């Protein structure tokens, strides 16, 4: 009789399976077929930040598009102001297993995490003029690979044990706590409206949870290995996933199937980092082929690449205005495209 | 034009760039080890003279006249995570730690071995062999017979030709042979040396690199 | 808590040599530059020395250039600054000001409890011509400035400091930058203005807005300040 219960499992499955197919009366591409290409995306490294002496991990833009942390396996989280490339901030982390960083929207906090599985929150608005770990969330156990902030008191982690938790920074306790995923959970996103966030794990599947039910509204499985970087769309109804299979996956929320898939033949790296531009027709994927592709993300046909990394592109952020990119590599330089 | 408050911040800048790159030299004499083997293997006490300093990573930290070494031992099964392996590639050497009088879980060492050896991440680091249990080998190469575990056998099954087939078994999953060396130390446990052949590994993995740099080979 | 207790000040010949000293505790001191101002006993403030953080740049005024040596000693915390051949005209009370410089910084945010020192018998023009402004609680009041030259900087900041110094207690800042309002300032403060005109509002006066309102130029030293605008009821 306990094979009943899976029956429904597989019912449900067929189910879901049935709508999403009903559910799609044409292609993005087929839509997309009588739209002028962008052409050739001819970037140039503006700025070149030569700060840490290892491996970047991770960067988060401000919200004035001008000033950027950025986490470096050297033990520092140093946060640049990008226009001058001045370094407003050298904070040394008790733990050099660095995996993620965020900044604030506000701009008066900053987080990192990693193999410590601790969440170190440090404020850099203090009194005393030197930026102290105003907050350690702790509770997960695994490794922080990635977090983003909701606001000054709330903040989304993901973490190595297969769950997220959503915690609030003033009682350091898991507010809310995520879980469904069969695999590590390897990076998150905020929706612009920050009330649902999507998740990729290891498991080759995203999860948009909702942050105030705690529950998976939507679960995404069109990836053939590890989700290790996600981003949403700038309208905030469809977002973007990469994998170590060397394929991109555009999905959207409202129709929870596969929109769009990037790939090519020449290109058999896994990806590291994922973003999309402010009007979302640009989505800049960094690999770990040493470069940076810029799809389309109407056509799923590459526009551009921002080779100038001696290693592979670990972090890759968009600022808010669109203004510039910004990717961070392994070969310990954060650069500033434009 | 550069306004006051904008030099002031470029001097800010400077002042925190050569914080770090004196950090950096402090640093720059310590080496970064990488602990392996199983669990029983002798990962724990390798070195005999240690002081260990969150989930795995069990740092301990040791010097030998010169360097301050600090191997991070990594939890069993770790060995392929694929996600804690990529932040231990600037590791100088790994220090792979064996077990000889372990026939039974011997092929498991192996397999452990071939998957760091041959590792993506792994492919240049040159690994420290160290079959510990050397004492116990000893009287076990002459009560138990090696083909137990091993296919091909020891021809004449004696503590030295039997440890040397091992040692070599260890040794023969080196694809890479040019690209990497692996060092063989076949310790007793009560031995006060490893730290001695965990220097003389790490000095001569330092010198290649150097010369690397330098072009010469 | 940030604190900075001066001393060292006292009563000197004309032509004697002092050193004030000035204590920090309660902050990183070796991260912050340190700025010397004197107030004279019934004139405005004016900037006398400039010492950045970690000694690489010195600054001193036109009037003490040669005569005045600044100093400072992070691991003591302490800051220096050695009077030689002291005239009648440095007569004054000496505050050490707290100050970092980067990008979203509160230059002079603190100011230290000054030391006075009382002797025996190309630059930016800041006018402030409304020394007397007669106000009462519950109204509004609205302070000016002008300036010789445009302290609007081609990156877009205007370095204009508004300052508030209340009887018996040292000044302390108002507005940095003409638009950003100082930490633990009351929202009422409100600074605006453009080119070479500047003003500070108060929308509600409270009875802690009684005092001397000095605007200062960030611009390029030597920073010069305001006459002062004297709030009283």
């Known amino acids: 009789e306990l094979d009943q219960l899976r029956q429904e499992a597989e019912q449900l499955k067929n189910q879901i399976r049935d709508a999403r197919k009903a559910c799609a009366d044409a292609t993005l591409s087929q839509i997309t077929n009588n739209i002028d290409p962008v052409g050739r995306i001819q970037m140039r490294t503006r700025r070149t930040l030569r700060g840490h002496l290892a491996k970047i991990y991770a960067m988060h833009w401000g919200t004035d598009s001008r000033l950027l942390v950025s986490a470096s396996q050297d033990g520092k989280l140093i946060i640049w102001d990008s226009y001058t490339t001045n370094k407003v901030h050298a904070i040394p982390l008790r733990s050099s297993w660095v995996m993620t960083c965020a900044y604030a929207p506000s701009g008066n906090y900053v987080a990192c995490g990693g193999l410590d599985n601790i969440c170190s929150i440090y404020n850099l608005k203090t009194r005393e003029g030197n930026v102290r770990v105003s907050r350690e969330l702790a509770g997960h156990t695994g490794y922080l690979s990635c977090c983003r902030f909701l606001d000054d008191n709330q903040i989304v982690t993901s973490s190595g044990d297969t769950t997220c938790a959503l915690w609030d920074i003033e009682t350091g306790q898991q507010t809310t706590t995520f879980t469904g995923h069969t695999g590590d959970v390897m990076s998150l996103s905020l929706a612009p409206d920050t009330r649902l966030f999507v998740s990729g794990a290891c498991d080759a599947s995203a999860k948009l949870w909702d942050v105030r039910e705690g529950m998976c509204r939507q679960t995404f499985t069109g990836h053939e290995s590890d989700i290790n970087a996600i981003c949403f769309f700038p309208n905030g109804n469809a977002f973007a996933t990469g994998s170590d299979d060397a394929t991109c996956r555009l999905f959207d929320l409202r129709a929870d199937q596969e929109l769009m898939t990037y790939s090519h033949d020449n290109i058999i790296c896994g990806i590291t980092s994922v973003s999309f531009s402010k009007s979302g027709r640009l989505l800049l994927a960094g690999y770990d082929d040493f470069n940076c592709n810029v799809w389309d993300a109407l056509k799923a046909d590459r526009a551009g690449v921002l080779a100038g990394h001696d290693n592979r592109v670990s972090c890759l952020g968009v600022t808010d205005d669109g203004m510039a990119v910004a990717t961070g590599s392994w070969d310990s330089f954060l650069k500033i495209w434009n | 034009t550069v306004s006051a408050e904008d030099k002031a911040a470029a001097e800010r800048s400077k002042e925190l760039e050569k914080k770090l790159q004196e950090d950096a030299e402090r640093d720059a004499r310590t080496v970064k080890l990488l602990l392996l083997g199983a669990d029983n293997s002798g990962k724990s006490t390798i070195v005999k003279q240690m002081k260990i300093i969150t989930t795995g990573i069990i740092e301990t930290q040791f010097s030998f006249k010169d360097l301050h070494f600090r191997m991070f031992d990594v939890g069993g099964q770790r060995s392929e995570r694929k996600k804690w392996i990529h932040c231990f590639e600037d590791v100088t050497c790994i220090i792979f730690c064996a077990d000889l009088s372990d026939y039974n879980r011997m092929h498991e060492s192996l397999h452990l071995f071939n998957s760091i050896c041959n590792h993506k991440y792994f492919s240049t680091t040159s690994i420290v062999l160290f079959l510990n249990k050397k004492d116990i080998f000893q009287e076990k190469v002459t009560k138990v017979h090696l083909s137990i575990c091993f296919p091909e056998y020891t021809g004449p099954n004696t503590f030295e030709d039997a440890g040397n087939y091992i040692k070599n078994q260890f040794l023969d999953l080196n694809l890479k042979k040019e690209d990497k060396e692996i060092y063989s130390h076949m310790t007793c446990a009560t031995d006060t040396q490893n730290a001695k052949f965990i220097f003389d590994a790490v000095t001569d993995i330092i010198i290649k690199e150097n010369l690397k740099d330098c072009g010469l080979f | 808590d940030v604190q900075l207790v001066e001393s060292g000040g006292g009563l000197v010949q004309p032509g004697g040599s002092r050193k004030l000293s000035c204590s920090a505790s309660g902050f990183a001191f070796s991260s912050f530059g340190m700025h010397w101002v004197r107030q004279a006993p019934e004139k405005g403030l004016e900037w006398v020395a400039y010492?950045?953080?970690?000694?690489?740049?010195?600054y001193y005024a036109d009037t003490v250039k040669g005569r005045f040596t600044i100093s400072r000693d992070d691991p003591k915390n302490t800051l220096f600054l050695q009077m030689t051949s002291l005239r009648s005209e440095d007569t004054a009370m000496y505050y050490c000001?707290?100050?970092?410089?980067?990008?979203?910084?509160?230059?002079?945010?603190?100011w230290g409890q000054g030391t006075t020192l009382t002797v025996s018998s190309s630059d930016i023009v800041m006018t402030q011509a409304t020394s007397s402004v007669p106000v009462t609680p519950g109204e509004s009041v609205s302070i000016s400035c002008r300036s010789s030259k445009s302290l609007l900087h081609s990156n877009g900041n205007t370095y204009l400091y508004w300052f508030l110094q209340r009887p018996g207690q040292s000044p302390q800042l108002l507005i940095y930058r003409m638009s950003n309002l100082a930490s633990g300032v009351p929202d009422r403060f409100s600074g605006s203005g453009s080119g070479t005109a500047f003003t500070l509002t108060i929308s509600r006066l409270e009875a802690e807005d009684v005092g001397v309102y000095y605007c200062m130029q960030h611009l390029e030293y030597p920073l010069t300040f305001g006459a002062g605008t004297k709030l009283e009821l």
């Open positions: 010492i950045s953080s970690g000694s690489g740049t010195i």
């Open positions: 000001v707290r100050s970092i410089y980067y990008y979203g910084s509160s230059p002079f945010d603190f």
